[PDB]
Amino acid sequence: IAIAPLTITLVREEVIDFSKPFMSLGISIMIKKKPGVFSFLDPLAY
Amino acid sequence: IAIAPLTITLVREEVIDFSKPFMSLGISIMIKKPQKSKPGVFSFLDPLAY
Amino acid sequence: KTVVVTTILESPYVMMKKNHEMLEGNERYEGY
Known part of the structure:
Protein backbone atom coordinates (compact mmCIF):
# COMPACT_ATOMS: atom_id res chain seq x y z
CA ILE A 1 0.00 0.00 0.00
CA ALA A 2 1.30 3.44 -0.97
CA ILE A 3 0.44 6.43 1.22
CA ALA A 4 1.97 9.31 -0.74
CA PRO A 5 0.89 12.60 -2.35
CA LEU A 6 -0.21 10.80 -5.53
CA THR A 7 -2.71 12.37 -7.92
CA LYS A 33 3.64 40.05 -1.33
CA LYS A 34 7.81 52.85 1.94
CA PRO A 35 7.44 56.34 0.47
CA GLY A 36 10.47 58.57 0.34
CA VAL A 37 10.89 61.36 2.87
CA PHE A 38 10.82 64.03 0.15
CA SER A 39 8.10 62.30 -1.87
CA PHE A 40 5.97 65.46 -1.80
CA LEU A 41 8.13 66.79 -4.66
CA ASP A 42 7.23 63.79 -6.84
CA PRO A 43 4.47 65.45 -8.97
CA LEU A 44 7.01 67.83 -10.56
CA ALA A 45 10.38 66.97 -12.04
CA TYR A 46 13.61 68.01 -10.35
CA ILE B 1 -27.32 3.65 -10.68
CA ALA B 2 -28.01 7.10 -9.23
CA ILE B 3 -26.55 10.23 -10.83
CA ALA B 4 -27.22 12.76 -8.07
CA PRO B 5 -25.09 15.08 -5.91
CA LEU B 6 -24.84 12.64 -3.00
CA THR B 7 -22.46 13.44 -0.15
CA LYS B 33 -22.82 42.41 -0.93
CA PRO B 34 -21.33 45.46 0.86
CA GLN B 35 -23.63 48.44 0.42
CA LYS B 36 -22.37 52.02 0.35
CA SER B 37 -22.24 52.96 4.03
CA LYS B 38 -23.65 56.29 5.15
CA PRO B 39 -20.78 58.76 5.67
CA GLY B 40 -19.87 59.67 9.21
CA VAL B 41 -20.60 63.05 10.72
CA PHE B 42 -16.89 63.95 10.88
CA SER B 43 -15.98 62.31 7.56
CA PHE B 44 -14.52 65.52 6.11
CA LEU B 45 -11.25 64.68 7.90
CA ASP B 46 -10.96 61.30 6.16
CA PRO B 47 -8.43 62.25 3.41
CA LEU B 48 -5.69 62.99 5.96
CA ALA B 49 -4.93 60.54 8.75
CA TYR B 50 -5.58 61.43 12.38
CA LYS C 1 -30.81 -3.05 -21.15
CA THR C 2 -32.31 0.19 -19.83
CA VAL C 3 -30.86 1.60 -16.60
CA VAL C 4 -33.05 3.67 -14.28
CA VAL C 5 -30.83 6.72 -13.67
CA THR C 6 -32.59 7.92 -10.53
CA THR C 7 -31.85 11.49 -9.47
CA ILE C 8 -33.13 14.14 -7.09
CA LEU C 9 -34.47 17.59 -7.97
CA GLU C 10 -31.89 20.10 -6.71
CA SER C 11 -30.57 23.42 -7.98
CA PRO C 12 -28.38 23.80 -9.97
CA TYR C 13 -28.25 20.03 -10.46
CA VAL C 14 -31.63 19.40 -12.17
CA MET C 15 -33.94 22.07 -13.59
CA MET C 16 -37.59 21.51 -14.46
CA LYS C 17 -37.96 22.53 -18.11
CA LYS C 18 -40.34 25.46 -18.58
CA ASN C 19 -41.70 23.89 -21.79
CA HIS C 20 -42.01 20.30 -20.56
CA GLU C 21 -45.78 20.03 -21.08
CA MET C 22 -45.33 18.58 -24.58
CA LEU C 23 -41.96 16.96 -23.80
CA GLU C 24 -41.64 13.25 -23.07
CA GLY C 25 -38.90 10.85 -22.09
CA ASN C 26 -35.48 12.08 -21.04
CA GLU C 27 -36.22 15.57 -22.39
CA ARG C 28 -38.24 16.71 -19.36
CA TYR C 29 -35.21 17.22 -17.11
CA GLU C 30 -32.05 19.22 -17.78
CA GLY C 31 -29.32 20.16 -15.35
CA TYR C 32 -25.92 19.27 -13.96
Missing part, protein backbone atom coordinates in the same frame (compact mmCIF):
# COMPACT_ATOMS: atom_id res chain seq x y z
CA ILE A 8 -5.65 10.24 -9.07
CA THR A 9 -5.16 10.13 -12.86
CA LEU A 10 -6.86 8.17 -15.62
CA VAL A 11 -3.79 6.08 -16.46
CA ARG A 12 -3.08 5.40 -12.78
CA GLU A 13 -6.72 4.52 -12.03
CA GLU A 14 -6.95 1.68 -14.57
CA VAL A 15 -3.98 -0.15 -13.01
CA ILE A 16 -4.00 0.97 -9.33
CA ASP A 17 -6.96 1.13 -6.95
CA PHE A 18 -7.13 4.63 -5.44
CA SER A 19 -8.84 5.28 -2.11
CA LYS A 20 -11.01 8.28 -1.32
CA PRO A 21 -9.13 11.59 -1.66
CA PHE A 22 -8.04 12.90 1.73
CA MET A 23 -7.34 16.39 0.34
CA SER A 24 -8.30 18.60 -2.60
CA LEU A 25 -5.93 20.74 -4.65
CA GLY A 26 -5.46 22.41 -8.02
CA ILE A 27 -3.26 24.73 -10.00
CA SER A 28 -2.89 28.10 -8.27
CA ILE A 29 -0.85 31.28 -8.68
CA MET A 30 1.24 33.37 -6.31
CA ILE A 31 3.26 36.59 -6.33
CA LYS A 32 5.70 38.54 -4.15
CA ILE B 8 -19.89 10.69 0.42
CA THR B 9 -20.63 9.85 4.06
CA LEU B 10 -19.52 6.95 6.23
CA VAL B 11 -23.00 5.49 6.68
CA ARG B 12 -23.63 5.68 2.93
CA GLU B 13 -20.25 4.23 1.93
CA GLU B 14 -20.82 1.23 4.20
CA VAL B 15 -24.01 0.31 2.32
CA ILE B 16 -23.47 1.75 -1.20
CA ASP B 17 -20.48 2.24 -3.50
CA PHE B 18 -19.04 5.72 -4.11
CA SER B 19 -16.69 6.65 -6.94
CA LYS B 20 -14.20 9.50 -7.10
CA PRO B 21 -15.80 12.91 -6.44
CA PHE B 22 -16.65 14.93 -9.55
CA MET B 23 -16.57 18.23 -7.63
CA SER B 24 -14.82 19.68 -4.59
CA LEU B 25 -16.89 21.54 -2.03
CA GLY B 26 -16.97 22.72 1.56
CA ILE B 27 -18.65 24.97 4.10
CA SER B 28 -18.62 28.67 3.22
CA ILE B 29 -20.11 31.97 4.43
CA MET B 30 -23.05 34.08 3.26
CA ILE B 31 -22.94 37.85 3.63
CA LYS B 32 -24.75 40.60 1.77
